Design a binder for this molecule. Structure first.
Ligand SMILES: NS(=O)(=O)c1nccc(-c2ccc(CO)cc2)c1-c1nn[nH]n1
Ligand SMILES: [Zn+2]
Length: 228
């Protein structure tokens, strides 16, 4: 079943993949859960997204040391908002190499985030320029276009049925696209479909604010966005 370490919750999704879940109480909304991933790649671990805070991100790392007991080689963060990048200082203090879209790093000061140590860039078709994402193992990084934010990125896990849509994708039973304050309403639908087309074989779609879902999450998000 699910495991807890401090304020964090961990769910095993596949033999080498776990989902990390952290919570932040928002003054007039209550607790909001955010999800990221932990991937075991041979003798090392790869992390996708921080928790909301530095303390919560340190809890992820200590759970990894306790449960997997393999070095964390790198972390990829999916856009410059608190749920995804709020724990950058904890990753840096633990000596983990950090990667984010160049645009996330450029927006990070205005967004109140700490930039990653390295910038990822992308081809016109959305795929990460390989020279900018060295030794990423099974992590396949894809920029689907502007949607939840202009800098949002996605990641597939090679050798699994998993693709991570971060905050771009909502579950198949979602009634709204969430916070559209920094969103591109014109391009959102095409970006949601581009994520789906980049990872055609992925049958488990992991996202930031809902539990893992089928490909139905991709099409239902795109239909909601078509109405924007
Ligand atoms: N990453 S963020 O800074 O923009 C953010 N911060 C806090 C809370 C939410 C949030 C999550 C779910 C819902 C349910 O409809 C509403 C808001 C988000 C959000 N919205 N969409 N993706 N994430
Ligand atoms: Zn966001």
């Amino acid at each position: 079943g699910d495991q807890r370490f401090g304020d964090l919750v961990f769910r095993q999704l596949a033999p080498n993949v776990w989902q990390h879940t952290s919570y932040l109480d928002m003054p007039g909304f209550g607790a909001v859960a955010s999800n990221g991933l932990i991937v075991r790649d041979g003798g090392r671990v790869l992390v996708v997204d921080t928790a909301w805070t530095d303390d919560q991100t340190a809890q992820i790392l200590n759970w990894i040391k306790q449960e997997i007991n393999l070095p964390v080689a790198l972390a990829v963060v999916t856009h410059a908002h608190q749920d995804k990048m709020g724990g950058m200082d904890a990753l840096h203090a633990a000596g983990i190499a950090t990667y984010a879209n160049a645009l996330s790093n450029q927006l990070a000061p205005q967004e109140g985030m700490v930039a990653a140590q390295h910038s990822l860039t992308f081809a016109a078709n959305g795929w990460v320029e390989p020279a900018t994402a060295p030794n990423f193992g099974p992590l396949k990084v894809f920029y689907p276009g502007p949607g939840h934010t202009s800098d949002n990125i996605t990641v597939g896990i090679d050798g699994t049925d998993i693709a991570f849509g971060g905050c771009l994708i909502k579950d198949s039973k979602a009634k709204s696209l969430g916070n559209l304050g920094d969103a591109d309403t014109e391009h959102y639908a095409a970006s949601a479909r581009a994520f789906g087309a980049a990872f055609p074989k992925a049958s488990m779609i992991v996202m930031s604010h809902s539990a893992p879902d089928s490909r139905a999450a991709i099409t239902h998000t795109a239909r909601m966005a078509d109405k924007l």
